[PDB]
Structure 1
Amino acid sequence: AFDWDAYLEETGSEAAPAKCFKQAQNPPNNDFKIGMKLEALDPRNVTSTCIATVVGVLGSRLRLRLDGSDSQNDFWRLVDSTEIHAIGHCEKNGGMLQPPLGFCMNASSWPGYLCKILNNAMVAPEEIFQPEPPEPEENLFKVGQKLEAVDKKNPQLICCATVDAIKDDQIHVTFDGWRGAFDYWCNYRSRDIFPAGWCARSCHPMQPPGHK
């Protein structure tokens, strides 16, 4: 557990208040199990809803892999993400499940494939998907404030970070102790940022500053 209070005192810094974040006040319970299938937007084509399997769980997050794709493009979503739903959600809403961009077979093999993977599949029940947290009405972050942020280049990691700059609804996230290469702009509504102390509360590892 990272000592945020000692860290904020020594850097003469404030953590961004919880009201800045589109995150729940308390980290949502994660009742997903490895092997459970669900529906997720394909990160490599966000127009597509695809079948994903939980291949890992960490705190309130799921490590997801699209069935029929590859093991090199796994992605992480919170259990209260609006980009994941129970199987059947897409159809109920007038849509059609799609092959993943990285589908390992040819496209005419898709309809048969879906039948095969869904047959006696372990499926995440709709009740374990958590409600979408309220969002702030505006960007309330201020330059200099610290927070916990996903390293988008190594998304298993959530790390000590600082708001470097602000432009309207976008905040600039920089990772304490790391070269500016891991920096990124995101919307203040990002699900990839958390108030200080959130990881410890959710049982997710939280990376201390880098040694540079």
Structure 2
Amino acid sequence: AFDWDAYLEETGSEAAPAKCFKQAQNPPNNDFKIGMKLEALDPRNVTSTCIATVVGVLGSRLRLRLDGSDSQNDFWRLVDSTEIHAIGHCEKNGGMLQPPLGFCMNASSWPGYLCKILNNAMVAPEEIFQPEPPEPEENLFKVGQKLEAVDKKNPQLICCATVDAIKDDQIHVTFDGWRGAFDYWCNYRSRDIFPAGWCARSCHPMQPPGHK
């Protein structure tokens, strides 16, 4: 557990208030189990809804892998992400499940492939998907404020970070102790940012500043 209180004191800094974030007041419970299948937007084509399997759990997050793809493009979603749903959600809504972009077979093998993987599959029930947190009505972040941020280059990691700059609805996230190489701009609505103390509360590891 990272001592934010001591760190905000020695850096003469403020943590961005919780109201800045599209996150729940309390970290949502994670009742997902490794092996459970669900529906997710393919990060490599966000128009596609694909079958994903939980290959890891960490705090309120799921590590996901798309069935029929590869093990090199896993992605992390919170249990209250709007980009994940129970199987059957896509169809109920007038849509069709797609092969992942990294699909290991030819496309005409898809319809039969879907049947094989869904056959007696462990599926996440709809009741363990958590509700979408309320969003801020505007960008309430201020320059200099600290937070917890997913390192998008190593998304398993949530790290000590600072708001460097603000342009309208975008905030510039910088990683304390790391070269500007891990910096990024994101929307203030980003699911990848959390108030200080959130990880400790969700049992997710929290990276201290880098040694640079």
Structure 1 residue 203, shift from structure 2 partner: 0.1
CA-to-aligned-CA distance 1:49-92 (integer Å, 9 cap, x gap): 00000000000000000000000000000000000000000000
Task: Name the SS of the counterpart of 2:148 in structure 1.
Answer: strand
Q: Please, what is the CA RMSD of the aligned residues?
A: 0.1
Alpha-carbon distance in structure 2 between the residues aligned to 1:8 and 1:141? 16
Structure 1 residue 145, shift from structure 2 partner: 0.1
Alpha-carbon distance in structure 2 between the residues aligned to 1:45 and 1:181? 25
Structure 1 residue 131, shift from structure 2 partner: 0.1
- Alignment-derived partner of residue 55 in structure 2: 55
- Alignment-derived partner of residue 37 in structure 2: 37
Alpha-carbon distance in structure 1 between the residues aligned to 2:139 and 2:156? 26
Alpha-carbon distance in structure 1 between the residues aligned to 2:176 and 2:162? 7
Structure 1 residue 207, shift from structure 2 partner: 0.1
Task: Name the SS of the counterpart of 2:189 in structure 1.
Answer: coil
Unaligned runs of 5+ in 2: none
Structure 1 residue 199, shift from structure 2 partner: 0.1
The size of the alignment, in residue pairs, is 212
Alpha-carbon distance in structure 1 between the residues aligned to 2:188 and 2:108? 41
- Alignment-derived partner of residue 17 in structure 2: 17
Scaled by the length of structure 1, the TM-score of the pair is 1.00
Matched, 1:112 2:112: yes
Alpha-carbon distance in structure 2 between the residues aligned to 1:197 and 1:82? 23
CA-to-aligned-CA distance 1:8-66 (integer Å, 9 cap, x gap): 00000000000000000000000000000000000000000000000000000000000
Task: Work out the percentage of aligned pairs sharing the same amino acid.
Answer: 100
Alpha-carbon distance in structure 2 between the residues aligned to 1:93 and 1:15? 40
- Alignment-derived partner of residue 83 in structure 1: 83
Q: Which runs of 4+ in 1 moved over 2 A?
A: none
Alpha-carbon distance in structure 1 between the residues aligned to 2:138 and 2:195? 16
Structure 1 residue 197, shift from structure 2 partner: 0.1
Alpha-carbon distance in structure 2 between the residues aligned to 1:179 and 1:41? 31
Structure 1 residue 122, shift from structure 2 partner: 0.1
Structure 1 residue 149, shift from structure 2 partner: 0.0
Unaligned runs of 5+ in 1: none
Structure 1 residue 96, shift from structure 2 partner: 0.0
